[PDB]
Amino acid sequence: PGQGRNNNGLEIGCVVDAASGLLTFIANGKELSTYYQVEPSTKLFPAVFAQATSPNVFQFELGRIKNVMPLSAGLFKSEHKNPVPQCPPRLHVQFLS
Amino acid sequence: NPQPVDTSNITIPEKLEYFINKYAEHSHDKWSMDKLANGWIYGEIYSDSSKVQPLMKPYKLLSEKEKEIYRWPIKESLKTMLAWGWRIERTREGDSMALYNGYSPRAIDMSNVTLSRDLHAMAEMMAENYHNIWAKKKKMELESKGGGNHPLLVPYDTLTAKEKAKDREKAQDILKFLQINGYAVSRGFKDLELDTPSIEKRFAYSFLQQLIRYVDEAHQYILE
Amino acid sequence: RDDYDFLMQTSTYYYSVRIFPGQEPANVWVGWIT
Amino acid sequence: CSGGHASNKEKEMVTSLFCKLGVLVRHRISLFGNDATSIVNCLHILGQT
């Protein structure tokens, strides 16, 4: 729709299928047309490239949607079967320098 | 003695009607937010003691008579902004939403919206106009009263940050809402042509031209 | 709401990014990198 | 190299300054009320310029 989105900050949702390699993106509750198919054993790092136009730019919301594991259940082996989203201290934001 | 930039002659274009709208709406929304924060309630009678407000109905249910004087500051703001010649360009997504088409307590948190520093100088100087308007009206009121002086009547740069705060923040909120709408605001004109190749364009050449002219005048004086 | 059996047997993972209001979305890219 | 380049028009008109003030100060030290030292300083620095 463009323009007004202030009802809630633009929520781009990244969905990864580790069994098929399908990369689908959810934007404000609707699936986007762009999809990426990757090859087996690919290690994908969650990443955001942004140019700062405000003091608050973006936020890594580590959560879950209906019928999907959170990112922690895939990142960590000890939390493989835990549907509750988590953010252990090991995970942290890195920047290219 | 401050003169505000007069703009009574200038008129708003029709393409700015769509901007006049939704800003009538947004100002009504934020005014209702302030009222509900103060405990104002939707009551048909406007009694201050019981805190019942008949203006809580949405903008569409609001009457046009109170929509005037309401739209008045918005009208003068856009009029003055155009009076400098500054141009605003509307983007396609605006008309897309146009054709797309109890009370509603949704408001926009505009604090994190940021303008450029050019837009900041823009807002500062147009806000200086706003302070000049206020100073002119207060000067007229005070000379009519014939006695007194006001501490904030001092010149704009003489005002402090907290004193400027109201005028500045209303300046940014209007220009930021404009930017998020997509009306591309810029200065009236851009440099048609600058004579950079001019050898006299530099300071040194003009200085030494003045110097040689004055020293030759002094020469014919000294001959005299 | 969500089916626990499907939910435990699935291998799909999700994270989301909130672009804050006032930050131009055209200057923000979201996804995965290797 | 960060700028600081007078044009050749600059330099020719500077030479015009030098020549014209020489013409002025030709035998006029008596008229100059002891500022003749200022003229002498000015002509040195111009000679270096």
B104 Cβ neighbours under 8 A, 6+ residues apart: B29, B58
Method: cryo-EM
Q: Alpha carbon of A64 to those of B116, B194, D36: distances in Å?
A: 36, 59, 90
Give the closest of D10, D17, D23 to B205, CB-based.
Answer: D10
Of B126, B103, B111, residue with least CA distance to B41 = B103
State whether A14 and C6 contact (CB < 8 Å).
no
Cα gap D39→D24, rounded to integer Å:
10
Cα gap C19→B165, rounded to integer Å:
28
Cα gap D49→D25, rounded to integer Å:
19
Give the closest of A3, A7, A54 to B181, CB-based.
Answer: A3
Closest-approach residue (CA) in chain B for C22: B113
**Residue B47: DSSP 8-state:** B
Asked whether the beta carbons of B139 and B6 are under 8 A apart, the reply is: no
Look up residue C23 and give its two tokens: 């930050």
Q: How many Cα atoms occupy the beta-carbon half-sphere of B185 within 13 Å?
A: 24
Tell me the helix, strand and coil percentages in chain B, rounded to 5.
Answer: 55, 5, 40
Q: Which residue stretches of B16-155 are H helix?
A: 17-20, 23-37, 64-67, 71-83, 92-100, 117-145
b/e string for A52-65 if b means 16 or more Cβ within 10 A? ebbebbbebbbebe
Cα gap D41→D35, rounded to integer Å:
10
Asked whether the beta carbons of A17 and C11 are under 8 A apart, the reply is: yes
Residues in chain C: 34
Exposed, middle or buried: residue A93 (CB in 10 Å: 0-12, 13-18, 19+)?
Answer: exposed
Closest-approach residue (CA) in chain A for B90: A3
Beta strand B41-42 pairing with A30-37? unpaired
In one letter, which amino acid is A57? V
B15 φ/ψ sector (left φ>0, alpha ψ -120 to 50, else beta) = alpha
Of C32, B113, B107, residue with least CA distance to A60 = C32
Of B107, B92, B141, residue with least CA distance to B34 = B107
For tokens 């013409």, the residue is: D23
Cα gap B55→B103, rounded to integer Å:
11
What are the residues facing A17 on neighbouring strands? Answer: C12
B205 touches chain D (CB under 8 A): yes
A23 Cβ neighbours under 8 A, 6+ residues apart: A14, A15, A16, A17, A35, A36, A37, A38, A44, C31, C32
Q: Alpha carbon of A85 to those of A68, B125, C33: distances in Å?
A: 11, 50, 22
- B215 neighbourhood in chain D, CB within 8 Å: 17, 20-21, 24
Of B201, B197, B171, residue with least CA distance to B185 = B171
State whether B204 and D10 contact (CB < 8 Å).
yes
SS (H, E, C) C1-34: CCCHHHHHHCCEEEEEEEECCCCCHHHEEEEEEC
Q: Alpha carbon of C31 to those of A14, A72, A73, B118, C11: distances in Å?
A: 6, 17, 18, 33, 18
Among B21, B30, B114, the strongest candidate for a mutation testing the A interface, having the largest count of A CBs within 10 A, is B114
Cα gap B148→B142, rounded to integer Å:
7
Which DSSP helix (H) or strand (E) runs through D11?
Answer: helix D8-25
Cα gap A32→B5, rounded to integer Å:
49
Of B195, B208, B215, B213, residue with least CA distance to D6 = B208
Cα gap B208→B214, rounded to integer Å:
10
Cα gap A54→C9, rounded to integer Å:
41
D40 touches chain B (CB under 8 A): no
Of B76, B106, B84, B96, residue with least CA distance to B16 = B76
Beta strand C12-19 pairing with A69-70? parallel
Of B22, C30, B93, residue with least CA distance to A10 = C30
Chains C and B touch, using 3 or more CB pairs below 8 Å? yes
